[PDB]
């Protein structure tokens, strides 16, 4: 069928009904009262499955859109249809079908070309062809524009996303996850934007669904996402926003904003431009970091990445082999000399990043004319703490020569733990960086953990409570209190600064990286 009794809140008709008037899906009782939340979170793969199975598929959500988003009007006839692609692997029936229902009930059929369901080699009895046919038989109860396609073997996100993209028909495709619910008028703002310029990749903002209670919650994250040298998307910090031009430190919720990085895999894009700009790096293995490789390459090769604060999508906040490291390595091909820093932050890994295929990627980058990563930093993300590698002047052991020991993260680069003094051994547990633009002293393996006068590590904040100065005589001076740290007594205490005190004079290797990153041999 095409449509079956439409209406507001159910734009594609009454979904999932049998030819007898009864829902083709039997909701489950209320979850048991004696429910061990940690064990039920497992059963569901990161969320309360008992509760999900008790909630309706036609679950109505709150309108997360700012008020000024509803005063916008869209002429649905002058908009181009789009193909929504939902990849999934072993996603439970209740959350997958609730995603489909949410889309169909919250998308005008006039602008929705199709809803592509990509089975990435699932093994659950209700998905498989050789199973009980629950999914397949339930789809017959949905509009015909809902299509299912399969992968013999699980290929990962990059592999599954491409399968649906290549299969789509609309000029524009929208990627969503398998555990989502939409706010009203979520697709209209994206289509209007990609219509005026096909080089635009537009991200809907992300709200959340609690893993344990399914309560709808505001994402809170802004629009602009930077990145951490651990190669992870990272929302602009307050001091990073302060570096924006005044006209953009607090823009209206209705206007689109550029973002250096993508929050996940949730976006829309004109199909033709998507392939012209490189699509995905199909040699990325399973899941991880494809979103950064897409953002860097997109900006560098004549594209634009934008958010849409008037396009909200709820997304369950849930509570791999050597693949995740391989992915990061390949991403560094787009980072040029900065790869030297990122390589050390992830621990100078030595894997098989599939070099022969990565070279073919580098010739493509050259043949396309993509800009450099230096341009990327100076033009797309100049608000970062490291815009040029000269902003990392020190990277090495922090040694106090008098006691013959150097600092040690104590196996804990993560924030919250006290730092020790240990005999130097040249390992990554004893190396530290310096970000001069913010006065931060961090272990190389975690640029989110910053040293404090307390002697401990803590989450970095671009403020006075984390600003250090490395003096000409080797003192580590906390700028706020004008005190210098000492190794006296194999203990880290703050004292009065005196270049004569040998316990407060330190050595810090200078970070003078090469102008070109040479990938490690395999």
Author numbering: 100 to 418, 426 to 628
Which of the paper's sentences describe this entry?
O-glycosylation of the protein CST1 by the mucin-type O-glycosyltransferase T. gondii (Txg) GalNAc-T3 influences cyst wall rigidity and stability.
To examine the role of Mn2+N in catalysis, we first verified its presence by solving the x-ray crystal structure of apo TxgGalNAc-T3 in the absence of Mn2+ to 2.9 Å resolution and did not observe density for Mn2+N. We initially hypothesized that Mn2+N was aligning the sidechains for GalNAc binding. However, a comparison of the substrate-bound structure and apo structure shows that the Mn2+N binding residues adopt similar conformations in both structures, indicating that Mn2+N uses an alternate mechanism to influence activity. Loop II is disordered in the apo structure and becomes more ordered upon peptide substrate binding.
